[PDB]
C-alpha cells in the first residue's frame, strides 16, 4: 500500500535524524516532587512525580549508575535512552526529559494513569477475543513502525503495556530495545515470553517480537500464558516443544494466528515470511479490524480504565518508598558520556 510506504519511509527518516543527534540533559531532578514510586527493578524504579513549575504530572525512571555497571546493562540503558528519545507512534510512551546526575541516569515519560494491562487482566480474568483483537491491533502497528526502523523490542509483556485515558496501549519500558541489522545474540527478557531461538543461544531476528506476540495473545485471551512452570529450564523446555494446548473457548481463527505466531521454526513464523507483517494483518483473526481508524484512534476502546485525574495512581500498586540519594561524588562518569 502507497499510504503504508510512505508513512513507513518517512517514519525512518525522522528517526535517523535523531538517532544521529540525540536529546541530552533537558531538565534536572530538584525541577520535580517525587509523589509515589509506580514499580521496581534490581537496577531502576519507576517515580511518578510532578515538576514544578509546570503542574504536569510525569513517570521518572530512575537509574543507579553503580548498579547498571554491575548487572552489565551500561549499552542497555543507552540503546533505550537513544531509541526513546529518537521514536514516535501513537502506542510508545513519549520521553520528555532525560538527564543524569552524580548517581544516576533518570528518563522522564508521559505518565499513563490508566496502569499495567496486567492488572486489568488479571482483574477480569480474560479479554474477550474483541478486546484482545483491539490491543493486539495497536501490537501489530507498534512493530510494524519499530521493525522498519531495523529495532527489536524485546520485552513484550502485560506489564509493560499501560493503558491510557482513552483505553489505548502505550508501550513502556525500552532496557532491551536494540538498532540491529540483521541478527543479535544477547539473552535477555521474561522467560514466559522467549523464542526458542533465544533459549537455544542462537543469532535471532525480529521474528522473537513476534513469537512475543503470539504468547501475549494467547494470555491476553485465555487469562495465563501458554507455557508455565516453576522453573525458567521447565518452561524453556516447553517453549521448545514445538506443542501448545488452546482452550476449547478459543475461536478457530485464534487458533490458526497463534499456530502461526507460535512457530518454533523462526524461518516459517508469521511477521517474518517474505509478506513481513501482512500475513498477520490479513489474517482472518483480524478480519473485522480496521487498521487505519486504530492507528487514527478513532475505534472506541472496550474498557476505559477508572481514575480520577492526571495524578491519580489507583491503578499502580504499593512499593515500599525509598529515598533518592545524589553522591557527593560522581560515579561511572565515563561510562555513561553518551547519556
Ligand atoms: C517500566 N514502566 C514504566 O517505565 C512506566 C512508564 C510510564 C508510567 F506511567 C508508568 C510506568 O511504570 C511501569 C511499571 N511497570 C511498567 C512500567
Not at 64 to 77: A, P, R, W
Request: hydrophobic residues 40%; contains cysteine.
Amino acid at each position: 500500500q502507497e499510504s503504508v510506504k510512505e508513512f513507513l519511509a518517512k517514519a525512518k527518516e525522522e528517526f535517523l535524524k535523531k538517532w544521529e543527534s540525540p536529546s541530552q540533559n533537558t531538565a534536572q531532578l530538584d525541577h520535580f516532587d517525587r509523589i509515589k514510586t509506580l514499580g521496581t527493578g534490581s537496577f531502576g524504579r519507576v517515580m511518578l512525580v510532578k515538576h514544578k513549575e509546570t503542574g504536569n504530572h510525569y513517570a521518572m525512571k530512575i537509574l543507579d549508575k553503580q548498579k547498571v555497571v554491575k548487572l552489565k546493562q551500561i549499552e542497555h540503558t543507552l540503546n533505550e535512552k537513544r531509541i526513546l528519545q529518537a521514536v514516535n507512534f501513537p502506542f510508545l510512551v513519549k520521553l520528555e526529559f532525560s538527564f543524569k546526575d552524580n548517581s544516576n541516569l533518570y528518563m522522564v515519560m508521559e505518565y499513563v494513569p490508566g496502569g499495567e494491562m496486567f492488572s486489568h487482566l488479571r482483574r477480569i480474568g480474560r479479554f474477550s477475543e474483541p478486546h484482545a483483537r483491539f490491543y493486539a491491533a495497536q501490537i501489530v502497528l507498534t512493530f510494524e513502525y519499530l521493525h522498519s526502523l531495523d529495532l527489536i523490542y524485546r520485552d513484550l509483556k502485560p506489564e509493560n503495556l499501560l493503558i491510557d485515558q482513552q483505553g489505548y496501549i502505550q508501550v513502556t519500558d525500552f532496557g532491551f530495545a536494540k538498532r540491529v541489522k540483521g541478527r543479535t545474540w544477547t539473552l535477555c527478557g521474561t522467560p514466559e515470553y522467549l523464542a526458542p531461538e533465544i533459549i537455544l543461544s542462537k543469532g535471532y531476528n525480529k521474528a522473537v517480537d513476534w513469537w512475543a506476540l503470539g504468547v501475549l495473545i494467547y494470555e491476553m485471551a485465555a487469562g495465563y500464558p501458554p507455557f508455565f512452570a516453576d522453573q525458567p529450564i521447565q518452561i524453556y523446555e516447553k517453549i521448545v516443544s514445538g506443542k501448545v494446548r488452546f482452550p476449547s473457548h478459543f475461536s478457530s481463527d485464534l487458533k490458526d494466528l497463534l499456530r502461526n505466531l507460535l512457530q518454533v521454526d523462526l524461518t516459517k513464523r508469521f511477521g517474518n515470511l517474505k509478506n513481513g507483517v501482512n500475513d498477520i494483518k490479513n489474517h482472518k483473526w483480524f478480519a473485522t479490524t480496521d487498521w487505519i481508524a486504530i492507528y487514527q484512534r478513532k475505534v472506541e476502546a472496550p474498557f476505559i480504565p477508572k481514575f480520577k485525574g492526571p495524578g491519580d495512581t489507583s491503578n499502580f500498586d504499593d512499593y515500599e518508598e525509598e529515598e533518592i540519594r545524589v553522591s557527593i561524588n560522581e560515579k561511572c562518569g565515563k561510562e555513561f558520556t553518551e547519556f
